[PDB]
Amino acid sequence: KDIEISASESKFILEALRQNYRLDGRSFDQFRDVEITFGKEFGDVSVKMGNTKVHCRISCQIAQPYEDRPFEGLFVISTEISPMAGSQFENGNITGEDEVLCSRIIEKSVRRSGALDVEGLCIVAGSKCWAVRADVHFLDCDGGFIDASCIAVMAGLMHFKKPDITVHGEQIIVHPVNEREPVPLGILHIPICVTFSFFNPQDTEENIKGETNSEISIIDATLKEELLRDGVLTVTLNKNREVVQVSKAGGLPMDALTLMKCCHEAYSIIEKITDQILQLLKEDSEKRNKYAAMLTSEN
Template identity: 40%
Template sequence: MVRETEPSNNEREFVSKAVAEGLRVDGRAHNSVRSIKIVLGPELGYAQVQLGKTRVMASVSCEIVRPSAGNPTDGVLHFNTEFSPMASPAFEFDRISEEEVMVSRMLEKALRRARAVDTEGLCIVAGEKVWAIRVDTRVLDHEGNLLDCACMAAMCALLHFRRPDVTVIGEDVTIHTAEEKNPIALSVHHIPVCVTFACFNDGEHQVVDPLLLEEQVMDGSMTFVVNIHRELCTLSKAGGTPVSPDQVMLCASIAAVKSAEITQLIRQAVAEDAKKRQTDKK
């Protein structure tokens, strides 16, 4: 159940003391991520990810647009995030919160700026027509760590998505339906995964994948964006308590392991969905 109120002083003290003693309110270890459930489809480009009780859906759509003058051969990749008031009493209708802005910016950094998707492969006619890919993420249930869940949902949706095939003859561009030609998957270079840590006790202790209660009590947070090759795409720590270099390196090594595990889950879900679709066609 989503928390509707700020934690009391007793709750704050309890969570902080528990973390200092190596415990967490839900029984997990400091370096344990909640259970992950991935649901894809039925339409291509739709994904829903559940991280514990936090749930986010993502859908991908596309249209043909004119490229920017500075990047005439690059397609467009855009992220839009919506926090539904149904997900948490903290979210207000028609009002953008700081957390919503933060999640949108981090998705931009994690997926677009890290060049997870080959935007050059979205070019149809240089300087004239390119594909614009839009990823809409919507928070359905908020029980902590929205960013990591939203990143997984967006990445699953991008891997699951297929754009229409096109034929270019001179200046004429023909967009084919799925019945005429098989849609084409996006070219994905790598799968960045967000792994967030909550900091407690003046930065002395960190826990991965914080619950909402832990987020409300923490002294600060730190997010690593890592792929399966252990490449650090982005490290974000906006304010909060300082963290020692040794603690940062420890969290980075944990993030690399968690990223590899989550990447395997994503790939498995996409492969199983593709296999099911092939079976249904027969």
């Protein structure tokens, strides 16, 4: 399972960056357009950026909490790749490296960051809590998965609602779904990750001892773009201007002064897209309630 590209094609794109061109039609520092569409279920969404397609799912159920944090509920994200999304991939390799490179990000992007209040999953302390689940599916790759799965999970959390609960010791009263309403969830902050994609037009030494910074960085590598890149970097931020994570794990060497200059441009990008989610969550729920207005008057 190996992608084969000519070195002639390798120089071609490398030339295009040397004349400030890229094959998609975007700018270097331009991001794709995002299509968000929900299914009928809560925590159901289809997210699409041109060629890359994803789908995720949020659910929850009853379990006991750990001994470790006996206060808090349970939550984890599955991101199992299927070779459906591209023939590179093993059947569910949870031990591949790029998978881990997809994993630990979303592990830190959600779980260690804590966008979601796990303490608001405590139904009863130590007895019964929530087990909230996030199964990420990939559909078709043009890269940006780890940015797409960044979004589509956080999209899904802002669309899921959990049903109604009443406690009497052991008499724990899960109510019928349609009499007593499902209840949405508590998001502390909304993180958005950004892939950065790096291209030395030169050898090693002109990056190493060539003092002249000459390295091109772009956003959202397409599939062919992604196969030649030299370093890998993802930052994540919010609306309140705090930096969630940064991960440059090796690759090409890279100036620090670039990275701050990189990460500022992230901010203006992610903010506009964030609010686009925020209206569409409202507007769909508005469309839910206008169709709820088109239901009770109908019934």
